[PDB]
Design a protein around this ligand. Sequence first.
Ligand SMILES: [Zn+2]
Ligand SMILES: [Zn+2]
Ligand SMILES: [Zn+2]
Ligand SMILES: [Zn+2]
Length: 162
Amino acid sequence: MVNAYEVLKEHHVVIKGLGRKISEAPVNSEERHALFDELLIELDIHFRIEDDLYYPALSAATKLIAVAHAEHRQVIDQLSVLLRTPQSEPGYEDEWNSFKTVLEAHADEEERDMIPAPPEVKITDAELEELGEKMAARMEQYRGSALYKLRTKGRAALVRSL
Ligand SMILES: [Zn+2]
Ligand SMILES: [Zn+2]
Ligand SMILES: [Zn+2]
Ligand SMILES: [Zn+2]
Protein backbone atom coordinates (compact mmCIF):
# COMPACT_ATOMS: atom_id res chain seq x y z
CA MET A 1 0.00 0.00 0.00
CA VAL A 2 1.81 3.11 -1.29
CA ASN A 3 0.63 6.69 -0.79
CA ALA A 4 1.18 10.05 -2.43
CA TYR A 5 3.79 11.23 0.10
CA GLU A 6 5.90 8.09 -0.31
CA VAL A 7 5.76 8.33 -4.10
CA LEU A 8 7.12 11.87 -4.02
CA LYS A 9 9.69 11.25 -1.30
CA GLU A 10 10.98 8.14 -3.03
CA HIS A 11 11.24 10.05 -6.30
CA HIS A 12 13.11 12.92 -4.60
CA VAL A 13 15.65 10.28 -3.47
CA VAL A 14 16.00 9.11 -7.08
CA ILE A 15 16.53 12.66 -8.33
CA LYS A 16 19.05 13.47 -5.60
CA GLY A 17 20.84 10.22 -6.39
CA LEU A 18 21.14 11.10 -10.06
CA GLY A 19 22.43 14.55 -9.05
CA ARG A 20 25.14 12.93 -6.91
CA LYS A 21 26.15 10.53 -9.72
CA ILE A 22 26.36 13.44 -12.16
CA SER A 23 28.51 15.42 -9.72
CA GLU A 24 30.83 12.48 -9.22
CA ALA A 25 31.35 11.74 -12.94
CA PRO A 26 34.13 13.55 -14.83
CA VAL A 27 33.09 16.79 -16.54
CA ASN A 28 32.12 16.22 -20.20
CA SER A 29 32.44 12.43 -19.86
CA GLU A 30 30.12 10.05 -21.72
CA GLU A 31 28.87 8.88 -18.32
CA ARG A 32 28.03 12.39 -17.12
CA HIS A 33 26.14 13.24 -20.32
CA ALA A 34 23.99 10.09 -20.11
CA LEU A 35 23.30 10.67 -16.43
CA PHE A 36 22.24 14.25 -17.14
CA ASP A 37 19.73 13.03 -19.76
CA GLU A 38 18.41 10.54 -17.18
CA LEU A 39 17.95 13.41 -14.72
CA LEU A 40 16.06 15.47 -17.31
CA ILE A 41 13.66 12.55 -17.87
CA GLU A 42 13.00 12.10 -14.15
CA LEU A 43 12.68 15.86 -13.62
CA ASP A 44 10.16 16.18 -16.48
CA ILE A 45 7.90 13.51 -15.06
CA HIS A 46 8.34 14.68 -11.47
CA PHE A 47 7.09 18.21 -12.09
CA ARG A 48 4.22 16.83 -14.19
CA ILE A 49 2.94 14.46 -11.53
CA GLU A 50 3.22 17.31 -9.00
CA ASP A 51 1.39 19.78 -11.26
CA ASP A 52 -1.19 17.33 -12.66
CA LEU A 53 -2.09 15.18 -9.64
CA TYR A 54 -0.50 16.10 -6.32
CA TYR A 55 -0.76 19.88 -6.12
CA PRO A 56 -4.42 19.89 -7.37
CA ALA A 57 -5.31 17.57 -4.48
CA LEU A 58 -3.69 20.13 -2.20
CA SER A 59 -5.34 23.16 -3.83
CA ALA A 60 -6.92 24.34 -0.55
CA ALA A 61 -3.47 25.58 0.53
CA THR A 62 -3.59 28.46 -1.92
CA LYS A 63 -0.50 30.41 -0.78
CA LEU A 64 1.72 27.34 -0.54
CA ILE A 65 0.43 26.15 -3.92
CA ALA A 66 1.49 29.46 -5.45
CA VAL A 67 4.93 29.11 -3.85
CA ALA A 68 5.23 25.51 -5.07
CA HIS A 69 4.56 26.50 -8.67
CA ALA A 70 6.91 29.48 -8.45
CA GLU A 71 9.60 27.07 -7.13
CA HIS A 72 9.11 24.97 -10.26
CA ARG A 73 9.80 28.13 -12.27
CA GLN A 74 12.97 28.61 -10.23
CA VAL A 75 14.22 25.17 -11.23
CA ILE A 76 13.24 25.54 -14.91
CA ASP A 77 14.81 29.02 -15.15
CA GLN A 78 18.06 27.76 -13.65
CA LEU A 79 18.07 24.77 -15.99
CA SER A 80 17.90 27.22 -18.91
CA VAL A 81 20.99 29.00 -17.59
CA LEU A 82 22.79 25.67 -17.09
CA LEU A 83 22.17 24.57 -20.67
CA ARG A 84 23.82 27.72 -22.00
CA THR A 85 27.18 26.49 -20.62
CA PRO A 86 28.14 23.08 -22.13
CA GLN A 87 30.33 20.73 -20.12
CA SER A 88 33.35 21.52 -22.28
CA GLU A 89 33.31 25.18 -21.12
CA PRO A 90 35.35 26.42 -18.14
CA GLY A 91 32.46 27.76 -16.07
CA TYR A 92 30.37 24.59 -16.39
CA GLU A 93 30.91 23.12 -12.93
CA ASP A 94 29.90 26.39 -11.26
CA GLU A 95 26.68 26.35 -13.29
CA TRP A 96 26.02 22.70 -12.43
CA ASN A 97 26.44 23.43 -8.72
CA SER A 98 24.10 26.43 -8.95
CA PHE A 99 21.48 24.24 -10.61
CA LYS A 100 21.98 21.36 -8.15
CA THR A 101 21.42 23.80 -5.27
CA VAL A 102 18.11 25.06 -6.68
CA LEU A 103 16.93 21.53 -7.42
CA GLU A 104 17.79 20.27 -3.94
CA ALA A 105 15.98 23.31 -2.51
CA HIS A 106 12.82 22.28 -4.40
CA ALA A 107 12.65 18.98 -2.54
CA ASP A 108 13.67 20.40 0.83
CA GLU A 109 11.08 23.19 0.63
CA GLU A 110 8.39 20.77 -0.50
CA GLU A 111 9.17 18.26 2.24
CA ARG A 112 8.98 21.09 4.80
CA ASP A 113 5.73 22.72 3.64
CA MET A 114 3.76 20.36 1.41
CA ILE A 115 4.54 16.72 2.39
CA PRO A 116 2.37 15.78 4.27
CA ALA A 117 -0.37 18.07 3.08
CA PRO A 118 -0.76 21.42 4.88
CA PRO A 119 -3.41 21.72 7.59
CA GLU A 120 -6.01 23.35 5.27
CA VAL A 121 -6.11 20.21 3.11
CA LYS A 122 -8.67 17.55 4.06
CA ILE A 123 -7.43 14.27 2.56
CA THR A 124 -8.09 10.79 3.98
CA ASP A 125 -5.59 7.97 4.35
CA ALA A 126 -7.57 6.04 1.74
CA GLU A 127 -7.48 9.07 -0.58
CA LEU A 128 -3.72 9.33 -0.15
CA GLU A 129 -3.41 5.68 -1.19
CA GLU A 130 -5.59 6.09 -4.28
CA LEU A 131 -3.71 9.29 -5.18
CA GLY A 132 -0.37 7.53 -4.69
CA GLU A 133 -1.51 4.72 -6.98
CA LYS A 134 -2.61 7.19 -9.67
CA MET A 135 0.70 9.05 -9.39
CA ALA A 136 2.77 5.89 -9.67
CA ALA A 137 0.91 4.85 -12.82
CA ARG A 138 1.05 8.33 -14.32
CA MET A 139 4.82 8.38 -13.65
CA GLU A 140 5.26 5.30 -15.86
CA GLN A 141 3.09 6.84 -18.58
CA TYR A 142 4.96 10.14 -18.39
CA ARG A 143 8.32 8.40 -18.47
CA GLY A 144 7.24 6.65 -21.67
CA SER A 145 6.30 9.91 -23.34
CA ALA A 146 9.42 11.67 -22.02
CA LEU A 147 11.58 8.92 -23.53
CA TYR A 148 9.66 9.11 -26.80
CA LYS A 149 10.45 12.83 -26.91
CA LEU A 150 14.13 12.36 -26.07
CA ARG A 151 14.52 9.48 -28.53
CA THR A 152 12.59 10.89 -31.48
CA LYS A 153 12.92 14.67 -31.03
CA GLY A 154 16.06 15.19 -28.91
CA ARG A 155 17.18 16.76 -25.66
CA ALA A 156 16.06 20.25 -26.73
CA ALA A 157 12.51 19.00 -27.23
CA LEU A 158 12.54 17.34 -23.80
CA VAL A 159 13.69 20.60 -22.20
CA ARG A 160 10.99 22.64 -23.96
CA SER A 161 8.31 20.37 -22.48
CA LEU A 162 9.12 21.13 -18.81
ZN1 LIG B 1 22.97 5.53 -15.72
ZN1 LIG C 1 7.95 20.40 -7.17
ZN1 LIG D 1 5.12 23.11 -12.38
ZN1 LIG E 1 9.05 17.33 -5.73
